[PDB]
Every structure is written in structure tokens, then in C-alpha cells.
Write a protein that binds this ligand. Structure first.
Ligand SMILES: [Zn+2]
Length: 381
């Protein structure tokens, strides 16, 4: 009777969709948001997930966990884990060569495996879907990066089961995006699809060949220097510099000032996709000083011009590795919040010599949309 849900369990944000009433619907959370932060915070009295957790990250950096997807299914000694650890404000410890995030919760030290943390984010996505549907959800399709190995896939599935979900299938994020656009519904004959995913924890480019509904990953490329946070850092530095030649004060060492400015910038980036201007209005940013300002989109698209231009190098590389010419790609698919930035669309379109783009589905929702279609297919509804 009950519909199964599709969940994009993202590094920074997650999204949940469901097929019902003949169409896919992406579900907004209780704050009206279509995507939810993959954050979990522990306080003296409660466990916060999603928006509530992200909202108090500045007040509780040591016990606000995020990026659990970077740890999931990995070993403590993994060089990736060892390297990422120096950048997180929360503690990660070794337990049988498995990493655990250690925090203070209700006055005591507690540690959680990465799948436990992600299970909490999945529980929130599940609850968001149940609030909307009005009934219990017990089945889901969850997505993962095409480059996840068996251990990362297992741990992601485990996170879903811990959350009380029967995991129908774990499918690749770029595959889910292709399914969202109905690109696997043709018949015999290879179709080459390129998925350009920008705005999340990392920049991923995937080239898939689809033949009679069968997906094959032909190439994967990316740039870890082009995560959504790297574009935000550009905005942050811009405003730190602006604040400096206005008040002759450098707020870069004040960890709290920088946090709120970061928050403001992310917010700014988004509206700049729809607006030609974005306003920053921070009361008492530094030493009681208020910061009200704004940024224009081409100052921004300019501020990040080199970063945006850099996204084409992994595209060129992927084509080279897949042994395909630009003209041999049949469809271009946008995923990730930053692909709605006009400059980004122009760069990809121009690189492909005027090709139009599959962009009718909000890019930061396409993966969950495809997961929702697949879940319905597997349920038989
Ligand atoms: Zn790089």
C-alpha cells in the first residue's frame, strides 16, 4: 500500500522524493526546505538533526557532526580519513581500525560509528517523508557515488536499516540522475550520458553508457578543490577583505565572526543564481560592528571565474578516458546546487558547442528524484 522513498544521502545535504499520484514529488521538510543538511548535533539535552543541527553549529562546533559520508565504510588508518581529520572540529577516534566520532552528549562522552551518524540523517529524511505522506515508510532506495566500494555501500545500507528502512537497492548517484530524466527507457543501442555534479561536497563528472536500460560507468573524474565550500571560501575572503578596508579590522582570526560570515555567504551564493544581487545583513559581526552589504552576480561569477572555468578540465579528462568526442555525448545532465549558476551553464553549454542541457529538474533534487522513480519500479507502483 505504502510508497517507497528515494533518498539522496549527500555529503553536505540530503534530499528525499516519492512517487505517488502518478508523479515524483520531492518532499520539503518542516522548515519548508527541499534539501536537508546532513548534520547531527549533540547537546546537554538533545540530539538535533538537519536544519536544527546546522543552525547551531557555531555554538557547538565540537559536538556538531557533519561529513560522516567521508568516513563511512572506511578504516581508521585510511589515508583519506587520517587527512580529513585535521580539518574537522569534532573528534574522531580509533575503534578496531574503524573510526568513530566522539562527542559530549547529555553530559557524557559518547562515540558513534559513521553509519550510526548517517542513520540519524536517514531517520530525519524518513520522518520528513512520513510527515508528508501521513503514513509509515518502510522501504527506500538510497544513492551513493559511483566510486564507492563494497564496504562504503554496505555501511550506507546499514545506516538505512538502522533507520528502520528496508533498503531495496543502493544505486549510483549519476545513474539516479539519468533515471530522473528517463534516459534509460529507450531500447537497444548505446546512449552516452554525461552527469555534471557541482555544488556539493565535491565536484563529480560521470560518463555512463546506457544500452536497453543497462548502465555502465565509462569514466569518472572530478576535482576535490571545487566543492561548494571552495566557492563559499571565495565569498568569505571577499567580505573579510571588504570589512577590513572599511573598519581597518581583520576578522579572520575570530572564529565566530568567520562562521557567521560563512553562513551568510552560502545563503548569498544561492540567491545569486536567481538574482543579479544578494544582500548580507549580519548584526554585530565583529566587536559589535554590524555588516550589511551585498554582492552582484558577476562580481561573484567573476570572483569565482577561475573555479567555474576549472570545472571543464575534469569534463575533458572524462571524455578522454571514455574515449568519446564531445559530439558523441547524447545527453548532458545537471546535478548539484551550483549548476543553476548561469555562468556554469554557459561554460558547459559552450564547451559542448551549444548543446542544450537536461535541467528541468532542480539539480540538487535530481538524484533523489531518480532514486524515487527506481524505488517505485522495484515496489511495482
Ligand atoms: Zn584539484
Amino acid at each position: 500500500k505504502a510508497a517507497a522513498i528515494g533518498i539522496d544521502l549527500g555529503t553536505t545535504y540530503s534530499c528525499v522524493g516519492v512517487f505517488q499520484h502518478g508523479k515524483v514529488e520531492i518532499i520539503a521538510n518542516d522548515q519548508g526546505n527541499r534539501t536537508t543538511p546532513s548534520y547531527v548535533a549533540f547537546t546537554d539535552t538533545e540530539r538535533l538533526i538537519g536544519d536544527a543541527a546546522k543552525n547551531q553549529v557555531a555554538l557547538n562546533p565540537q559536538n556538531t557532526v557533519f561529513d560522516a559520508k567521508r568516513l563511512i565504510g572506511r578504516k581508521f588508518g585510511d589515508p583519506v580519513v587520517q587527512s580529513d581529520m585535521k580539518h574537522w572540529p569534532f573528534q574522531v577516534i580509533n575503534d578496531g581500525d574503524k573510526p568513530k566520532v566522539q562527542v559530549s552528549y547529555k553530559g557524557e562522552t559518547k562515540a558513534f560509528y559513521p553509519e550510526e551518524i548517517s542513520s540519524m540523517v536517514l531517520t530525519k529524511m524518513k520522518e520528513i517523508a512520513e510527515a508528508y505522506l501521513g503514513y509509515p515508510v518502510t522501504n527506500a532506495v538510497i544513492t551513493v557515488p559511483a566510486y564507492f566500494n563494497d564496504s562504503q555501500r554496505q555501511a550506507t545500507k546499514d545506516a538505512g536499516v538502522i533507520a528502520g528502512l528496508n533498503v531495496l537497492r543502493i544505486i549510483n548517484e549519476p545513474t539516479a540522475a539519468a533515471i530522473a530524466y528517463g534516459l534509460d527507457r529507450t531500447g537497444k543501442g548505446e546512449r552516452n550520458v554525461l552527469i555534471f555534479d557541482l555544488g556539493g561536497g565535491t565536484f563529480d563528472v560521470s560518463i555512463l553508457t546506457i544500452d536497453d536500460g543497462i548502465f555502465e560507468v565509462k569514466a569518472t573524474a572530478g576535482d576535490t578543490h571545487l566543492g561548494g565550500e571552495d566557492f563559499d571560501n571565495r565569498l568569505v575572503n571577499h567580505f573579510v577583505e571588504e570589512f577590513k578596508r572599511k573598519h581597518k579590522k581583520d576578522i579572520s582570526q575570530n572564529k565566530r565572526a568567520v562562521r557567521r560570515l560563512r553562513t551568510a555567504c552560502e545563503r548569498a551564493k544561492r540567491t545569486l543564481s536567481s538574482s543579479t544581487q544578494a544582500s548580507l545583513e549580519i548584526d554585530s559581526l565583529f566587536e559589535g560592528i554590524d555588516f550589511y552589504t551585498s554582492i552582484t552576480r558577476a562580481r561573484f561569477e567573476e570572483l569565482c571565474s577561475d573555479l567555474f572555468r576549472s570545472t571543464l578540465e575534469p569534463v575533458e579528462k572524462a571524455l578522454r578516458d571514455a574515449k568519446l568526442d564531445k559530439a558523441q555525448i547524447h545527453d548532458l545532465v545537471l546535478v548539484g546546487g551550483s549548476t543553476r549558476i548561469p555562468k556554469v551553464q554557459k561554460l558547459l553549454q559552450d564547451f559542448f558547442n551549444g548543446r542544450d542541457l537536461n535541467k528541468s529538474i532542480n539539480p540538487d533534487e535530481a538524484v533523489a528524484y531518480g532514486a524515487a522513480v527506481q524505488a517505485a519500479i522495484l515496489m511495482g507502483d
